[PDB]
Amino acid sequence: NQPLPRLTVAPTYDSAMSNWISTTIAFFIRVVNSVNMTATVNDLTRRTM
Amino acid sequence: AYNGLVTTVLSEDAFPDSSQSITHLPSMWKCLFLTLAGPMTSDPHSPV
From residue A12, alpha-carbon distances to A16, A19, B47 in Å are 11, 11, 40
- Provide the 3-class DSSP secondary structure of residue A28: helix
Q: Which of residues 6-35 of A touch B (CB under 8 A)?
A: 6-8
By C-alpha distance, which of B23, B25, B11, A15 is closest to A23? A15
Say what the resolution is, in angstroms. 3.4
Q: Are B44 and B8 in contact, with CB atoms under 8 Å apart?
A: no
Interface test mutation site (partner A, options B21, B24, B25, B27, max chain A beta carbons within 10 A): B21
CB contact under 8 A, B23 and A7: yes
Q: Are B46 and B10 in contact, with CB atoms under 8 Å apart?
A: yes
Q: Experimental method for this entry?
A: cryo-EM
